[PDB]
Amino acid sequence: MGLLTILKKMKQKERELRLLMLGLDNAGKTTILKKFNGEDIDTISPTLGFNIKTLEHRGFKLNIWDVGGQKSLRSYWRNYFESTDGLIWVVDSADRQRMQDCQRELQSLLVEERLAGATLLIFANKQDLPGALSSNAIREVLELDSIRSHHWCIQGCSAVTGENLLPGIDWLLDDISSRIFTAD
Amino acid sequence: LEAFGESAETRALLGRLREVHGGGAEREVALERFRVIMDKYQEQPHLLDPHLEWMMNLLLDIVQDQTSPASLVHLAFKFLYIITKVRGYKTFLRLFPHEVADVEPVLDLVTIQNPKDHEAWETRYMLLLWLSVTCLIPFDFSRLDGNLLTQPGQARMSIMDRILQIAESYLIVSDKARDAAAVLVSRFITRPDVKQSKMAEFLDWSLCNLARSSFQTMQGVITMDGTLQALAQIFKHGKREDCLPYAATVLRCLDGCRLPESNQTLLRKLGVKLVQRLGLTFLKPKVA
Amino acid sequence: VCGFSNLESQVLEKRASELHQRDVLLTELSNCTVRLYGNPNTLRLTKAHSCKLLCGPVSTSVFLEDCSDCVLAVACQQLRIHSTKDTRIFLQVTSRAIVEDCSGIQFAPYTWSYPEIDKDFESSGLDRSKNNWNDVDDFNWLARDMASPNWSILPEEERNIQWD
Ligand SMILES: Nc1nc2c(ncn2[C@@H]2O[C@H](COP(=O)(O)OP(=O)(O)O)[C@@H](O)[C@H]2O)c(=O)[nH]1
Numbered sequence: 001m002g003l004l005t006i007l008k009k010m011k012q013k014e015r016e017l018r019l020l021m022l023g024l025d026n027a028g029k030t031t032i033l034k035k036f037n038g039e040d041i042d043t044i045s046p047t048l049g050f051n052i053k054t055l056e057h058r059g060f061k062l063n064i065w066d067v068g069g070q071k072s073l074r075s076y077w078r079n080y081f082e083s084t085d086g087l088i089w090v091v092d093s094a095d096r097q098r099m100q101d102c103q104r105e106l107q108s109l110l111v112e113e114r115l116a117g118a119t120l121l122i123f124a125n126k127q128d129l130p131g132a133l134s135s136n137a138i139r140e141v142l143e144l145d146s147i148r149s150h151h152w153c154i155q156g157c158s159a160v161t162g163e164n165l166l167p168g169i170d171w172l173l174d175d176i177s178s179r180i181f182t183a184d
Numbered sequence: 185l186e187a188f189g190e191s192a193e194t195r196a197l198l199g200r201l202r203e204v205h206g207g208g209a210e211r212e213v214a215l216e217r218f219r220v221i222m223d224k225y226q227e228q229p230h231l232l233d234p235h236l237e238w239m240m241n242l243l244l245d246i247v248q249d250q251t252s253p254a255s256l257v258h259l260a261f262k263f264l265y266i267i268t269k270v271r272g273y274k275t276f277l278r279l280f281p282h283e284v285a286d287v288e289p290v291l292d293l294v295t296i297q298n299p300k301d302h303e304a305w306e307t308r309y310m311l312l313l314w315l316s317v318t319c320l321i322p323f324d325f326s327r328l329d330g331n332l333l334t335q336p337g338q339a340r341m342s343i344m345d346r347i348l349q350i351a352e353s354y355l356i357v358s359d360k361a362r363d364a365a366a367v368l369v370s371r372f373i374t375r376p377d378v379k380q381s382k383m384a385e386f387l388d389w390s391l392c393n394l395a396r397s398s399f400q401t402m403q404g405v406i407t408m409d410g411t412l413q414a415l416a417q418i419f420k421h422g423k424r425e426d427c428l429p430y431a432a433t434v435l436r437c438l439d440g441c442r443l444p445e446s447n448q449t450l451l452r453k454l455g456v457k458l459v460q461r462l463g464l465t466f467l468k469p470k471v472a
Numbered sequence: 473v474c475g476f477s478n479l480e481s482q483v484l485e486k487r488a489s490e491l492h493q494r495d496v497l498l499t500e501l502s503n504c505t506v507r508l509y510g511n512p513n514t515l516r517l518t519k520a521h522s523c524k525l526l527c528g529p530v531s532t533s534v535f536l537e538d539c540s541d542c543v544l545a546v547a548c549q550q551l552r553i554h555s556t557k558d559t560r561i562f563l564q565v566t567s568r569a570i571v572e573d574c575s576g577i578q579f580a581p582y583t584w585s586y587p588e589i590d591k592d593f594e595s596s597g598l599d600r601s602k603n604n605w606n607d608v609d610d611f612n613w614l615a616r617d618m619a620s621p622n623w624s625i626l627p628e629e630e631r632n633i634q635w636d
């Protein structure tokens with residue numbers, strides 16, 4: 001294979017990024033995806049499997065995946081940890097009882113050999129809820145400050161109103177483009 | 185080429201399938217017309233990305249109907265394959281269905297395929313890749329079967345069992361279906377339940393295939409290439425702690441197979457590939 | 473934050489002023505009956521035994537967890553169940569419902585109504601013409617032909633539950 005052909009292939013791969021969306025069940029993982037494209041969210045059903053959506057944004061082709069947040073669907077997340085350029089963990093801010101499950105899920109995902117090369121985006125969804133925890137409180141219960149081998153970040157959003165999602169996606173895309181290539 | 189300026193023609197050609205599947209001259213004309221229309225974007229098929237879904241769904245509502253005859257279903261699958269060579273399967277399969285109601289309808293279709301029918305090889309190719317895009321489902325194959333002791337006298341065979349018996353049979357064929365069998369196992373053995381159930385059986389089968397096969401008998405070489413491709417894909421898309429336990433026996437067998445001295449370029453390439461796949465299972469992935 | 477925690481044989485009640493877009497969480501309840509009169513934003517039930525919860529429309533989904541011998545009657549957009557046994561829910565779902573680690577579950581069409589109800593349905597934004605109480609999905613049972621042995625439609629004889 002010639003250098004010219006090798007370069008034509010490197011460009012096509014860099015033009016297509018991969019973002020794996022995960023998080024506990026009923027955290028708005030589907031609502032954010034449906035709002036980021038301009039679809040309707042009132043007719044959303046609880047996902048009983050997984051979904052994929054290929055969109056374009058800022059000249060980048062984003063193939064966003066969305067896996068179920070159920071326990072029987074958590075033993076299969078390893079089936080989507082390949083060629084993942086970025087990870088997006090959704091957390092329910094109004095949920096104060098299951099705050100350790102997410103902290104335990106994110107810790108187990110951070111010690112993954114295949115996910116070491118990606119940008120972490122923490123979407124604290126459900127902010128308009130009266131009993132929703134602010135970004136500072138969530139940044140202390142999920143143990144995000146301790147992280148050092150991952151370019152993480154935490155921003156509060158509300159999928160129903162489509163607020164603060166575009167800045168987060170832009171930051172994620174910028175941090176992903178800051179690098180050159182990824183590992184095999 | 186900025187956009188697809190042949191949408192109406194392709195739509196009409198696809199719609200004419202339901203009234204050209206009983207013809208032999210018109211069928212070939214439509215095929216040759218669909219080929220020359222799709223070959224124009226062979227150098228930049230990305231321009232067809234916005235159209236993929238609609239054409240795919242058209243070809244799907246013809247092969248996903250119960251009143252569809254085998255002949256009509258075979259033309260739709262030939263068209264589907266024509267769209268997967270130009271866009272490629274790695275990118276065109278991400279849009280295929282993946283709902284839990286598509287696991288038994290696709291395995292049952294895979295169980296009415298004629299392996300000796302060389303004219304319908306595109307059908308078998310499109311079948312295996314579809315069955316493989318349906319092994320991503322985040323559920324156990326056991327939850328789907330339900331109750332196996334419902335048929336007295338003869339118990340039904342499990343979905344996972346059927347898939348293991350489909351992959352082993354298609355991995356020793358001489359057509360292009362063997363390549364579709366390499367993409368299926370890569371998404372069948374690399375899951376939790378299958379890993380604990382049939383990994384040892386598949387490994388014994390492969391070690392038996394590479395312990396009895398030769399690079400001289402034609403079918404022997406066919407058995408060698410498929411097994412090496414399957415092993416390479418498994419070691420590439422497989423977890424490192426479920427695989428490292430078997431890396432010691434795989435290399436010991438490959439060394440005795442004698443591939444470097446064999447007179448086959450594909451076999452040696454696959455052998456080097458499998459050797460480099462086992463080599464990284466021993467070390468830890470780094471991030472420079 | 474709103475709701476109830478740690479109850480035992482007690483009758484409760486709430487109005488719309490205390491449920492106008494708020495998180496209602498009912499944790500650790502036994503032999504207690506709640507009667508909500510509003511349109512909460514979210515509804516959750518956890519660790520309920522021999523309880524009887526009632527509520528009007530809902531803006532988001534509902535979430536039951538570790539409850540048994542309970543009798544629910546809501547009209548939400550989503551309803552998720554996890555580890556539930558011997559429960560009779562008169563739910564009105566506009567999208568779909570799910571039952572996980574559940575058993576001896578029973579369903580019926582939501583029929584509860586109280587004065588000043590059409591108003592509560594106007595602030596929630598739910599489409600009253602959509603009702604799929606007979607199309608629940610089961611994570612444990614994913615067969616194509618057989619019906620799950622963990623949920624059942626409720627007969628018309630048992631649907632007549634004396635609320636008052
Ligand atoms: N109040 C509020 N509710 C939300 C928000 N996002 C989602 N919801 C609701 O939360 C429920 C769970 O949504 P869903 O996306 O199905 O969760 P998922 O299935 O884990 O992705 C749905 O009924 C949504 O309408 C939000 O930002 N604010």
Ligand SMILES: [Mg+2]
Pocket residue numbers: 029030045046047068
């Ligand atoms: Mg979902």
